[PDB]
Design a protein around this ligand. Structure first.
Ligand SMILES: Nc1ncnc2c1ncn2[C@@H]1O[C@H](COP(=O)(O)OP(=O)(O)OC[C@H]2O[C@H](O)[C@H](O)[C@@H]2O)[C@@H](O)[C@H]1O
Ligand SMILES: Nc1ncnc2c1ncn2[C@@H]1O[C@H](COP(=O)(O)OP(=O)(O)OC[C@H]2O[C@H](O)[C@H](O)[C@@H]2O)[C@@H](O)[C@H]1O
Ligand SMILES: [Mg+2]
Ligand SMILES: [Mg+2]
Ligand SMILES: [Mg+2]
Ligand SMILES: [Mg+2]
Lengths: 202, 205
């Protein structure tokens, strides 16, 4: 496994470079080197935007997945369209749990009640430049109740529900039609675990 | 089956404003877009972290069923991880005029001392598109894991990297256990777990 621990790094200071809806911080730190020495003082720019909960809504009876479609303008420059097919997800605020956020967002974004849940994985989105961690759950849903247009208007959130079969969703990952990290991770996990999960939940 | 509903013709980007520029940038996108129930939104603003785009290389030894991991500190992991040293894929930013393949091969040498044989695309993904534009394009690369050892990275860039060789099965079990938990490695190693049988047959013929 890894070589060094938090006993091997000192964060000297963090400087807020930008404070708005999100923050950008300069971390100043020193750390042990693999060759046996200590680094000098290093600085890194880090995008601070909190952490998120992600829900894969899976119907184990029908072998169906619920996707949500919404515009993500940051996708515009490298994608055919900025509207993406994604997992239910939202930011975790102070004192909330991953699972309570997932359930609130499943209701607000897809009109879905969630039954049983299991953790998938918790991952760092891009840890060279952002602290963001996302914790994915799979949630038992009745996909026949998933339809229509959702999202909170007062937050300029406009979301369309799509229901597909599991195999169809995974085909869309293979084809590049679904290409955001949270959805790729969740649906690859589903393809590796669906036999046991469907058995557990049926 | 239809898929997504709207295209770039359905969104108007009114302006972008750089709010902060240093090594990276934070931009404010100002835009309007079509609504599903009809009509156009009002003006919306989003803060977007701009850091360019990256190439990622999963170094896979098909003879040995082994993967090469690189360990380095990622200080952004500190607040949510037991240690900021992460086990990762070879990866680097893509400079203008460069291909994903060119970057992947260069970084394999710089970060792991690895010569790469054949490559195949895995997947290209958006890291976190609600708040960053970053796209990462993953290749799998054919390597001899018996050549993978030691300390690498560019010291003049304060890049200090240690090579680890593990079995594919061990690497994937570490994803399941949360010991590997950065997106690029998770995506690449899940893909490998779904495709290694055919990939080994393809590359050992
Ligand atoms: N946050 C930072 N702030 C300042 N300088 C930095 C930073 N990150 C890197 N540098 C400088 O830039 C040099 C080279 O950075 P390269 O190695 O091509 O990129 P990558 O591997 O870091 O990022 C690639 C992906 O993997 C990661 O997970 C990222 O999140 C990306 O998603 C470093 O040695 C530093 O001097
Ligand atoms: N970039 C932004 N700039 C300004 N306001 C924003 C921004 N993003 C969201 N808001 C405001 O905050 C509201 C709620 O945004 P949240 O709870 O985070 O949900 P989510 O699904 O968007 O992001 C969750 C993850 O998925 C994505 O990939 C992200 O990268 C995350 O990783 C928006 O409707 C706006 O009012
Ligand atoms: Mg959301
Ligand atoms: Mg929401
Ligand atoms: Mg790198
Ligand atoms: Mg490098």
């Amino acid at each position: 496994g890894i070589t060094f621990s938090k006993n091997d790094v000192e964060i000297i200071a963090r400087e807020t470079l930008y404070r708005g809806f999100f923050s950008l911080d300069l971390y100043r730190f020193r750390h042990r080197l693999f060759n046996g020495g200590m680094s000098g003082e290093i600085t890194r720019e880090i995008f601070e935007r909190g952490h998120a909960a992600v829900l894969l809504p899976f119907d184990p009876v029908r072998d169906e997945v619920v996707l949500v479609e919404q515009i993500r303008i940051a996708a515009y420059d490298t994608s055919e369209s900025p509207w993406l097919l994604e997992m239910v997800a939202g930011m975790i605020e102070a004192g909330e749990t991953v699972e309570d956020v997932a359930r609130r967002e499943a209701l607000e974004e897809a009109g879905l009640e969630v039954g049983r849940t299991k953790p998938i994985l918790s991952y760092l989105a891009s840890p060279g430049g952002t602290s963001e961690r996302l914790s994915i759950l799979v949630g038992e849903v009745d996909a026949s109740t998933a339809k229509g247009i959702h999202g909170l208007a007062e937050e300029n959130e406009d979301i369309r529900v799509h229901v597909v079969s599991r195999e169809q969703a995974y085909q869309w990952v293979e084809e590049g039609k679904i290409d955001n990290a949270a959805s790729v991770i969740a649906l690859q996990w589903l393809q590796l675990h669906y036999h046991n999960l469907r058995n557990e939940w049926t």
